[model samples]
Every structure is written in C-alpha cells, then in structure tokens.
Target chain A: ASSTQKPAIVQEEEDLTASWTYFTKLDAQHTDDNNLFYSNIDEVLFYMNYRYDDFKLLDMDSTGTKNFETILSELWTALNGKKPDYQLKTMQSLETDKKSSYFIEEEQAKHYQEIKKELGYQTLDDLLSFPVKTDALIVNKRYGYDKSKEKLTLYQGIDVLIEDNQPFHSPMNGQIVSVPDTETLVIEKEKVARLTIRGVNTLRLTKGMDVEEGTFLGNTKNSTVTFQYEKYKKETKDWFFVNPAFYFPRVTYTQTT
Target chain B: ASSTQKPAIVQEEEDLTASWTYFTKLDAQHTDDNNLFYSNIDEVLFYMNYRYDDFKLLDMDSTGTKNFETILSELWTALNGKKPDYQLKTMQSLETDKKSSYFIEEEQAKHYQEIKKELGYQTLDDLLSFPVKTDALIVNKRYGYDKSKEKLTLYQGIDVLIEDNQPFHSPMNGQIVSVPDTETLVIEKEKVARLTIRGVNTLRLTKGMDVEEGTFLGNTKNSTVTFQYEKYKKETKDWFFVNPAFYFPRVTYTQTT
Candidate 1:
C-alpha cells in the first residue's frame, strides 16, 4: 500500500506496512469412524498460508472440501510448515490478542481534514471495500481499490468475464493504459492487478499497464477478466496472486447499539 | 458435554484435554500505570514453571486503555495464575496447536436421555462452556429447591432475603424443600439458601423448609431474591450469581422497517 505525502514537503517517505486478510471458512470433515476416536471434537482441519499480502494453499487438498477434522488437520500441518519469520496462531489465540495487536493507519489522521475539504479518505481503513473514487483509482495492497468515484477495481485472479451478466466498468475516469492503438494493457508499477474476463478467449498481455479510473480496459464480449498481482524486484519475479478475497476486506463495521 | 444413543448405547470415554487462553492490552492515558503494567506485563515476567498451562503475560501496551487494559490484564493474569496440570508454551507455539491439542471431555452414554430431555440440545457443540448440561441448567448439578411449587429442581445456587419496603417474590415456581418457623433468616443445607427480614441483620436457620413460588420467604423491604453458584469447587465457596441484565430492558425494539 502506498500513501502520498504533503506535496514535495517532507524528505522522509512513509513506508506503509501492507497487510491483507482473506476471510473464508475452512472445511475439513473427518469420517464418522475417525470422530469416534476423538473426545468432544469441535475442531476442523485446515490452514491458510499468508505470505506478505496474499494467502496461499500451502498443503490444501485439491477437493477443497473438508469437515472439522480435515480443517484442524490442515491447520496442524500448516503450522508445521510455517517459517520462523511469521507468527502462527489459532483462532482462540487470535481472539485473545486481537485488541492489543490491532493498528490503525496513519493516513486516517487526515479524516477530519478530508471531511472538511471534501477530498476523501486516504487510508485503507477509512474507506469501505469496493470504494468508488472519482476519476482516480487508488489500489491498496491490503484492502482493495477505492471505487468511490464510479471506477471499478479489477484484482488479480478475479475473472472479470465471469462476472454475472453485467458489463465491467473502469475504476477511474481517465484514459485506458494500453499500448497506443493496441489492446495490450501494461502497468509498470510494483502491484499490478490481473483480472479474468469471461467468454472471449483472447488473453491480453496486461504485464505492465496504466489506466485512469473509468477508462475502459477492453470490451469483453461474453468474456472474463483474470486479475492478478505480479511482483517484480530486480530479476526475481514471483507470481504471488491469490484469490482477491484475501486483500480486499480486512475489517467490516456494523451498526449496533 | 452430552450426546445421543439410540441404536444401542456405546459406552466410551474420550480424552478430555484442558487448555487456557490469556491476553492483555493497556491504556496509555490512564494513571493506573502500576496495576496496569503489573497485570499485563510484569505478572508473568519469569518462566518460573512450565506446564501445559503456565503463567505468561501478553504485552498489549501498544493498544492500552484504562478500563479495557484493566479488564484484559485481569483476564490474562487470572488465566496465567491457574495452575494447569500441564506445562507452558510461548505465544507463537500456543497458537499453532490450539485446535488440535485440547484435552477434551468425552460423552457418557448413560447421561444421554437426561441431556436431550432437559438440555433441548443433542450434542455438546450446541452449547457454550463445559458440561453442556451445566450450561443449560438441566442436570443434577442444577438441583435446588423451588419455593413456589414446593418442590426441588435440577437448579441450585440460590438465596432469599427479606426487605423492609419491597415484597418477596419467588424467581421460579417449584416445590419447597424446607421452611423454618421463625421469621429470621436461615441456611438449612450446605448448598441451601438463606432469607432475612427487613431492617434485621440476624440470620434465622430453616431446615427441611417447604415454600411455594411467589410465596414470601421474607418481607420485601429492600429485600431481593438471589441465586448462587460455586466459585471453583466444594472447597471454595463464593457468591457467584448470574446477572439478570435482561431483567431490565436496555432498549425497546420497535418495528420501523
């Protein structure tokens, strides 16, 4: 996630720590015979491997459906595979430490100012997922793109063409970032979104593309858009795009009295 | 926890694993720095002993608050102080195995019939806390005398007191067990209740007492009815009662939508 500082005023660049949360129910059901062995069995076997900002299926079964035993077993196996660098924990442990370990973004500090200036929230936490921002699109590494201004954000691994019968819209009001007169879209930034469009089989090389919000990337006639983030540092290019479910919605608020 | 047994009772006992979770956070603005720090930070500074559940403090100073930190620290430190039968683990290690490593309680086939009839639940997973029947107040452990119907129920931990201004009303309808002739407050059984008259401070003993629901155990001056539960076990007795938070309406629900 990148945050813009005061215009050419500060010398230090604020490095925002990017984090993502993928919310999915783990399924791992053990057979009834196996349940006989365990007492008060209330756990499933499953695990989610989060590397940086995306979640991976480190040891997930291909079938992808499991009950409690499978869910718990998968988590157990994943725990055994965790690297020393990352902190691994269970649901109960996470619950206990949730409040203490929580952090708010610094960009949210300008909330009141933005409210007065009518510019808009600049932090991922300040806005809701699928935010629509005017003619400009801001993609957060952890949370998804700001679509407040009527532009639609296409995340990686998401097939746009698969979207249910609705026309795909641009995330900003700016021009499409493509090779002049050609349909190839390329973005030269570190975190580029890859989406899947449905129907049409032609895959556009969106390796490096830039487009303003609302700019039409391409027309998918009964096609899908597959979006993914391609990370490049030096010569090492690691394809770490997971289902967009992970990075989009970190926390949600509900109105309760 | 309880389970069903229809096709033929299978007598089996599963391993009951014991586990605990502890966490804390602090409020930086509050001046109760000493208690806060001690409860959340210093309480488990040393790895003096190691068992499945040893004492360890969660360092939540990063997100500290006065009341919240106090509550969090109290919970964490209390759990830490509990002398678990097993050894201790670091924060990371604990999270990794929580789901897979709990010592669980097995369901006894003999306790099946009573569980379903009284608990209104079929399995242990349907309830909260341990001993599902205990949670539903539908077991022998819930045994207590009901003053209104002059009978005993599977609910225990209750008391009666007289008030000068208010009237004594039974919380439930049941058969009375024992009633004392004297108006003074009395505690008959070791787990029985006691009642007092308004403006009086002396206790009157009532053994083998029998009374009815809504019957005057004593006058209602400032009098009120009470229920009690054991703090830990028979060795330790304390005034542990359930709060009737819903007894008074916090808010009224209106069908606006």
Candidate 2:
C-alpha cells in the first residue's frame, strides 16, 4: 500500500527555503562552526560555486542514515507528510534554478584530482607518516562525532594524548600555509591537513615555507595534546576527518628498557 | 726519540684517585646520569661484573681526538710527563684492580647483541620511524656536538620547530617508562629513546603502559614546541642524541593543496 501511494512534492518558496536554510546551517556548523556556517541560500551557493566538491561532507563509511538527499527528502516529508519524488515536474522545476548548489560525484573526483596534481601527490600513500617520533600511549581514540548531536558528523577524530611540550610533527609532506597560533599550522599537503592541538602553546613558521616529511611543526604548551586528522573532497563537496591510525605501520610497544 | 721514550706511569694514591674521580664522574655522567654515572667505585665494579663489555664511552665515529684510552693516557701524562702504556706492566699494574673499565670493539658488539635479544629487537631498524608523518621544514640539521664544549658530544642532535599543540606521535613501538617531567619520557624499543619536550605541561600515562605504534602522546603547553631526540647504546655504555631525520623514507613538502 505504501509503495503504491503517490509521493507529494512541495513547491512553495517559503517552505523549501526554510528547510534548506535550517538543514544546511546545521550540517555546515557541525563540520566547522567558526568557518562554514551559512544563513542565506546565496552563501551556500557561494561555497557550491568555489568548493562544490567539498560541500557534502559525506560519511565515507556510509554507515550513517542521514545523508544529503535523505535530509532534503525528509524536509519534504515533515512539511507535507509525504516524500518528494525529485523526478516530479514541480520539484524538478524548483531544482533547476539551484542546479549549481549541490554535489556531483564526477565533478568532485575531478576537482580532487586537480588539487592532488597541483600538490604533487602521487598517491594517498605519500600523505601518511607518524606525527611524533618517540613511543606514545594513546589516551583517547574517539573524537568529532557526538551521537546526541548527530548532524552529519563526517570524521573519525583520533585524539592522541602526548606529554606537555612534546613537539608535534607533520604526518605528510606538505607546505605550511600558516604556523601555530591558538591551534596554528594549517598545512596544505595532499589533503588540507589541519591540526587541532590542545594545550597552551605558541607556533613558529612563515607562510609558503616548504618542508620535507618528518619536519617539526611546533611544540605544545604546558598541557596534554591531541592531534586530529582531516581531509576534504571536491567532487562530493565534502569535508571529513580521517583516521590517523590507518596511515602508520603496524607496530607495538611492549616494554620500556 | 718519542718511540724509544718510556711511558711514565703515575702510581701515587692521592693523584690516581683524584684524577680517576674527576674524569670518571664527567665521563660517566656524560653517558647517563640516571643509569650509568657512578658515585662510588663499587658501582663501576658491579657493572664490570655483569656487563664487562661496556665500561667506557668510545668515540665510535673516530672523528673525536679524545676517547676513553686517550683520556686515561692523558691523565697519566698530566700527572707524570708521557702517555701511559696501558698494555705495559707499569700502567697495567696501576689498572690491575680496575681491569673491568674501558670498551673493547669485539666485546661491545657481543654485549650489544645480547642486550638486543633481551629487549626483543631483531635489528636497529625495528626501532625507527618518522617523528612526524607530515613534511616538516628542517630548521636545524645540526645539534649535539659543540666544538666549544670540548666534551664527548657523541650524538647528532637535530632540532625541530613545530606548531603548538601540533600533536606529535611515537616513531617506534616502545613502552612509556616515564611521563613528561623536566623534559622527560624515556621510551625503549630497539634502542633506549628519550625525549626532552620543552614546555610547562602535564603528562597522562602510567609507567610501564603498553602502547602500540601510532600512539598519541599529549600536547604542548602555551608556546612553540621543540622536540629533542636522544638514544642510549648499551654496547658502548653511551648515551647520545640521535638525528631523527636520518631514518624514514626521503620525501619533500613542496606545495599546498
């Protein structure tokens, strides 16, 4: 009976814009509140124009139920008690004007390839290495996603607890976009490798500084430190936190000599 | 004239003990104040009973003019007028009671292998990895041996400047013997690795905690963090800073994404 029922498509500008603004703001804020939140539809369109591939923040594992298309479909269901068949003439007409506002898988892949080519990365393998040089004990493994605040949390935030002043290093070979500030050192490697170092500290480096693999980024202040790994995809228009554990070789710390 | 000259051996108790105490303390402390420095001659005797192979810090690189034998010979020369022929009876007689002191190349290799077996290391390669995974601009490629120090600076110390809270990782699989305290955190995998993290901060981890490869150490305090790498060799009974840049595959960070 449910399969046979007709899907209702909403065309009202007021209702559609309201749903779009709310979901987009919440999802963008979840990825990074200070940077990516958008209030008007035009702001979202702006990002879609420049960084179209990185707009979605797709769940790489695809384990989450909430996705871009689902969120849009749900918004229609909430308002009209029926899903929107995007193929319908009414919804299709609404989408025609906003054609440049969403992600296309092929376009994102091409964008990612272009960026990687410009960055001189041959493969994803070249983008990985250990962040520190000595043996370290992992204190926190989970980060980025809060189940209660599930608004498209797209990263597997791996937090590493290090000693105070334990200097941190770049995991991949990339150029320094910015040095350490509150949480400085925005490195542009194969992916834009950003660091979220927790501790009272200062950073040292100039912009456009070229570095080799295993280069020192900066030291931590007096406190425990955490390093988060992330990546952005242009084709899908998404941002994601990568698992730092996946990049290193399998080794174990058995005992201290 | 020099070849036919007899090497004078000082045998006076006052001079011998004073010279021994001065040079021995400095040399022993240079190796490891926590593990190898001897306050009393009895401790040296104890080490000689078990680890007969390692009693002196030899200049393995052969670049240094001062070595264990040279130092001892100079001590005799300063007290008398010529070098002490350690192989001859006069000088040999003076050292008969302290015969366990000094490094032997053959004996040290065997001692190093035995300790490696005990530490569960197959080779030195098992204990190395890049300090940080990302490409780092090497600010200082030189450290350790200072010409002004005139001391036995054995290590090739390299200084790395990283961003604050830029989380560093463990390069090798080794246990945490001590947390960060006074620039501390002694890790032992193949070689005895130690760190001198600069910052006023706290550490989170217990002694004897087992950490796998890619474990997260803590963050730095409020400031630019500097990480110092050093290692100890059982074969030589010597402790020196290691150049972390020596290991790892060669790669460069040329551009941003």
Candidate 3:
C-alpha cells in the first residue's frame, strides 16, 4: 500500500546518471538483451529501462485492489525514486565506516549545490505555464498521483509532446543556445534551467537570440514537437527529467488531463 | 516504460504495419475493444505522458497503461459533440493473452459426422476472398488444430469467436438465413456450412435470397468483421466451427495452432 502523504517538495530534476545510451539495436549474439528506449530518438536519453520497471510499476485504478491514497503514496515514491535531493542528505564518517565512500564525490556535491542554489526558483512550483496546448491524447497525457495543485497539475514523467501543424511558444524566458538550422531547438534560461524543443519547423528565432517566455519559438508544420525541461546540471553531472507547470483546461469531463 | 522492445507489431514491418494514423471518425457508438491507442502527437505531438498508472511511472508494461490511455481519449472524443479534426492513431495490436482461444475442444468431437465429415475442400477453398488479412495482426489468428506449421499460427476453441473487422464473402453458394438487416451476416451453404460474419453495413440482397460463392458483401465500415465457418450438427443441435482454407488467411508466426 502507498502512504497517504500528499508529496514532499517535489524534486525538479532527473538523474541522468541512472540513464544511459548506445547504438546497434540488437546484435545477434546478445539478441535478447537490455533494450530500454528512454526516448523515441535513439541518440538521446534512451534510459533503456534496467531495474526500475519491476520496482516502479503500480496501479492507478483507485477503485481496484488498493485505496486511492495508498496507491498515491506509492506513486510519490516512484517519481522521486530517480531524483534524490542530495543536498538534504548529509553523511558523517564514523568508526564503523570501513571505507568511507559517498555515492557522489565531494567535488561533484559542491558543484550541484551551487547549481541548485543559483537556479532562480525555490521549488518547481515557482515555475509556471507549460505554454503549449493544441490537443490531448491518452498516450500524450500522463498522470502522477500527487494532488497538490488547485486544478489539473503536471505529473512527474508527464510529457506534452505531440505531432501537429501549429506553433510552439516559449515555456520560459531564455536564449537559443543551439544553432537555428537544426530540427530541435534548445534554449537556456541563464543558469536556472534549459528547455529542449525538439522537431520544430520553419525556425523563427535567430542564433543566440533572446526572447520572453510564451513567445512563439517556431511552427510545427504538421510534424512533431517534443518538449522536455530540466534544471542546469552540466557541471554537477546530476541531471534528471523534470516537469514544469502545464496547460490543462477545465470542465468537459472525460478521462482527460 | 512500455516495453522498449517494440512488440512484433513494430519490429518486422516497422513501416506500414508498425504505425498507422487514419482520419479517425471514432464512432461514439463504436463499442469494439476500447480501441487501445498507444498515441503519438498528431499534426504536432510535443508532449509525452508517462504510464498513467504510476505517479512517477518508473516504467510500465503495456497491459492496462496503454489500454486506459486509449479509453481516455475515446471519452474525450465522445464528449466533443461534433466532428473535430483529429487523426486516430494506433498500432496494430495482437491479443497478447490466450483468453481469445481458450474456449475450444477439438477432441470433444462426439459426432464428428462420419457421413459427409471426411471433407476435402478443393476448388471450394479457392473461391472466396480470404475474410481476414492475417499478416496484419501478429498473433492469435487461427482456430483449428493442425501443428503443420510451427512457431506462428494459433489454433484453439470455437467459442472464442468474435465479430470484428474482416470482410465477409460467401465461401460457397449460400442463402442468407441470418436477418439481412442485422449487423451480422449469416449464410448457409448446403447442409454442412453456416457462415456468420459481423460488420456488414448495407444490404445488397433481400432475405431468403441465395448469393453465389465469392459475391461482394457490404462494407465492414472500419469497426470489425468476425468471420467463422461452421458445420451444422443434426441430433446434437449446436454447430462446430471448422477452419476452411479458402477464407481467413493462412496462419503465420504465432503460438500453439
């Protein structure tokens, strides 16, 4: 059973260390091996699910086996399982400590703390507006258990990706970091966060251009526009998939989110 | 984490059979399988929702996760009240479980009817346009026992019948006995055969009229056309469904046929 706890301050980053990538889909000798597709595109995140699924998968049919709260608590644990707030956890070596080794090094820890502190927002709640809402799909919309928001809130592991013929507005005030000639647009919000807007067409922004949040980034052109946001973690090497606020409409009740 | 290993639906024919997006009318009245769609963004898909079951959704298998996602979208579409522009996207899914064919017993051939029972269907099998496009679905495609083919072709119980999307055609000369107006089109060929086909839309002929072998039947209308050929038993009352080689395509790579 899950705990009744709503959710502690949610972690706003994904742990990239827990993820990996490679090539050659299936070799002959090792045909039946690890094949976790972290992302649709092969060169990216592609977590290649290792040990998580067995531990993380659970039920959300609240009316089923377990009560709603019980399952909700379990969901909280699952989402937070990957992204741990290392800053909250402190270790002190003692006589019982045979060979003291922290999961992360002291240097890495210092860098992470700096990034966490410098990132503009206090908690993910401080961030706002997912900024894009054209259509919703059963597969496109994911729901997590935490219910801390007033209306339909963003759930961890939720993706707002879609393939459509529309324009994408900026999710936050940022500067385009990647070259404008590419299919995917990456923007950096100073030292606070980074957003990857993948598969956009008719690129609108110029190289090293600065734009306000909610500005049109580019048109989707009947293609797909993939969206993902993460806190700045280049120096610390502690990155995780995170969710910002999203655009959810009201009324018109159906299994929508 | 819906299995990184794309089900056979996506593996071999990673092109047409792998994915399909039809201009979906999503009949509010379409009460087939929940039309479980594993969705992607359309016109533009930019977001991704993790498995809706688990909050953090470490990873999930396809069973309930994809099914419910599809159900949600179905509900959403149902609530729209008008023809909204959208493409219904889904993968060609096969019945992953054995529940479909768990209803038959070939050995229970009490009166296997020795008179006209030693049937050799020759030119008879060559006439009809095979009702089902077998290769379209990966598994769970057959229903009579003959381990003649290996590793691909399921054969099981007769009671596991379903009225789905396959087209219906007279396998032999038959008079339309089942009501002409009903969704299911039932016809009889001589004393041995009775064909039950579900998903016919219009009536080309009147009741009690005889149609020739390989005559054109009405459209399946995109819902489903369940076609099964049965042998009528006299004293035993009920009929037994047999696999005729002409209709229902030759079984391929499946299990325990």
Candidate 4:
C-alpha cells in the first residue's frame, strides 16, 4: 500500500525516516528557517526476523486442510469444495533458510584477523573487565523453550523475547563452576580449548557452566534453550549484566500503514 | 524428541501410578498408590500460537514486513523494508462450497415456501434466518492507521479480538448498504462480517458496531491495513473484558507434554 502524505512530514517519523530530533522552540526566534527542530539522534539499525509461523488461527496442532500455496488447501477448500487429497507436510520439515555464515568479504575477514587474534589472547574474565557500552541493549535473562515439552516456559515477570538469541562472548573465563542440569550448562571460561561452530569462535570454557561454542554442553531434545543476561544495574542483587541483543545483529522488519 | 519413558507413563505421569489406602484400612481396603499430586500441575491448558508473526517482540515503529496477496495479481508490497511496514490482517476470506441454490430444490423450498411468504422473504437473509444459526465474536475497532505516528492507538483499556472470517449472508436484506461512509449493521443474532477492500465493507467499523456484508467502505493506498471489530464489554463505561477467539468448528486438541 502507498500513502498520499507530505514527504517532509512523513520523513519526520523516526522509524520511517530513521531519524531522531532535538528540541526546538515553537516561536520563530528559536525555530529553524524551515520551522523544524534539529536532530541529535541519527542511527539506523537494520533488523530482520528469521522465523515466521505456518498455521493460522487454527490451534497449534491443527493444520487446516490446506496451506496458502496448496490447491484446495484449507483456504481453497473453504473457498471452493472438498477437493481431492494431495500431500501432507510435516511441520518439522518446513523450509529453514538459515545462512551458513554471515556474509562478509574475505579481505575484511583477513584484515580483522589480527584483531580477532589479539582478542583471542585475552581470557574470558579479562574480556569481562572491558568497559561496558551504555548504548548497548540490556536484556534480562529468561527461561528457555523446553524441547522435551516442546513449549515455552517463560520466567516470571520476564518479558519473553527471541532477541535474546544473539552472539556474544563470555564475561568470565573460568573452569566449570556449575553444571546445574544436563539441559543447562554453566561454563568455567577457563576449562577448555577454543571452540568454534559455523564461523563463530570462542575460547574460555567452564564445564557445567556457560561453555565456549560447540562443546555441545547438552541437547535441546532433552533440555530447553535458556538465554542469560542482565542489565547495567548496581541496585539489583546480581552484579554482572548480560544482554543478548548487543551480541546479535538486529532483526529486519517491514510494515505498511 | 526422544523420551525414555513410554507414552502411557508420560501421559498419565508415572508418579500417579498407584492407588491410595487408609492406615487402618491396610487391614481391609488398603491399596498401594502414588498419585500425580506429587508431580507438577497436570491439567495445563496449552495454547499454541497459530498466526504468522515476524518478531513477536516489537516497540513503537519497529521495523516490520508482510506480503498481502489478492486475486489474480502480483502480491502487493507495503512497507517492503521499513519500520511499521504492516498494519495487521483484519479478516481472512471465506468462500462457501454451496453449489445448488436453496430455491432450486423446489420440493424442499416448497416445504418452507409458505414460511417464506409469511416472512416476506426476498433476499438470502430472509431465507437463512429461518434456519441458520449465528454467533457473535467480540473484537477491537480502530480509528485509522497513522503512519506519522508509531503507536497503535486504541480506546484505552479496550481488549478485543477479530472473529475468524466466515461465509455468511449479509446482515441486511436491502439492495446492499452503499454509500461513501459505510453504516455499521449488526448481523442477525450477533455475527459480524470481516474486513473488506471495497463497497460499504471498506468503511472502518468497530466493536459492537454492526456491519452488513457488501457494504462499500474506505480504501487504503498505503501498504498497511486497518481492522475493526465488535468487542465484548460491560454495560457501564463500555470497558472490554475478554479478547475474543476466532469462531470455527470445534475440534479436540491433543497437547503433548
């Protein structure tokens, strides 16, 4: 759909135009010649969604007689008649367009190799000592999707958000401090060798605690996927603050009015 | 997902594998039993999300994207790659599989022909009202889609849900409600029609605001679409209570633990 609004007014929308504004007086003395306020924030973050649900208003278990693409699918049948039976699609077999790796230039990777190596030299604890960025998104930790239950058991008072799925390094490089359960791991950053999954890299391992990538702490089939992180808070009981969004790129979203 | 436990044990938790007995009854009707009361809550109402949503967690003017398809044409692109790209799907289209006309069944029609004469039947509504059943669904209504603004404005404290789309007779028996501003018509009993692109149906209606089928309404040039509904509320301040579920045939839900 298209809008027939003035371009300038439309552009003023921060989300649409991706701009932030500073204060301006309504009077001519403080107003710009164009009668617009100057902006102080101007950062554009690109985000995209990786997952889209398949079933419609039907109960989670009910896959209406059809899908949008299939002829005489639920939608078609509802529109037409009881058509011939065709094929059935297993929910687990739907398409997953996961990228093998974040597209990056080879030259750029080579250039960043030294920095990566330098960072690799530091221990997980040492990395945690790095100054925290105030602008970073601070997401609170929440419960995971229990694969055994095949459902989400959200933490109390914890807002459920998938943005918690992000890329980040551990705060402390220690030995396995605690492995509470098979489904959950508490890695002691100091316990293991550098690990890598796909292209993501990590060292510092703590068995039973948060471990480096790929040591395969456990399996989702048996346990749930838990996201850990806190905020930059001094008033709370917990000291360390972890945010998943800061570690991962924002998702992309497209909408209309 | 693999479970070492059997289906029966899983369904009826092993903890509740036995019967109960009284102390003194041990000499008489005593029985060995361990009830499910020792386990977590058993009767959990599991709700599965059936709709398609990209990024369930979003803020004001968060970037979003969705594709809208119409009959015999390329899909319409709304906010392609912009924030607030989608408004929301108001209604799903429903088509009836009815082939033969009710009147064509002359003998059957004659069985009720006297009733039609008494009821002054002319339009389909006059005929269907005599036999078909209608149910109401509570939903929320909207004013407009303000792209300049990021917030989804609603009558504060109002909770509503759009009823599932269905194929039903237009509420009115007249020559169709036609005009620039579509008038809301309450479907017989209480059912309301879904959102439409043209005719009186295009005019934005809201909770409790009835609308007849084939009513010409407004149009959207923008990619986003606005949905209106009939909300369930109390008689006092028009406060809404429940978020209505889409109406459909009843089917048993089998939830996996």
Over 4 Å off in model 1, which ranges? A1-156, A159-165, A171-210, A218-220, A223-225, A235-239, A249-257, B1-257
Per-candidate Cα lDDT values, in order, are 0.25, 0.39, 0.36, 0.22
What would the per-residue lDDT of candidate 4 be over residues A1-257, giving only the tens digit for each residue? 23421111112111111111010000111222222211111111110001111212211222322221121022212222221222322211121213322233455434334433333212122222211112332222221111123211212111212232343333334445544443333443332222111111223323445433323322122112233432222354322322222222221111100
What interface RMSD does each of the candidate structures achieve?
A: 28.6, 32.1, 20.9, 21.4
Residue B5 Cα positional deviation in candidate 1, in Å, after optimal superposition: 79
Every model's DockQ: 0.01, 0.01, 0.01, 0.02
> CA shift at B88, candidate 4, in angstroms?
39
Worst lDDT window (10 residues) for model 3 chain B? B9-18
TM-score of chain A of each: 0.31, 0.40, 0.41, 0.24
Best by DockQ: 4
Give lDDT tens digits, candidate 2, residues A215-256. 666776645455455565545756555444433432232211
TM-score of each: 0.21, 0.25, 0.25, 0.20
Off by over 4 Å in 2: A1-124, A135-139, A144-156, A190-200, A232-239, A250-257, B1-257
Cα shift from native, residue A174, model 3 (Å): 0.6
Q: Model 1: per-residue lDDT, tens digit, B43-125?
A: 22211111112222221122221122223333332333221221233322322343622212234322432432343212221
TM-score, chain B, predicted structure 1 = 0.24
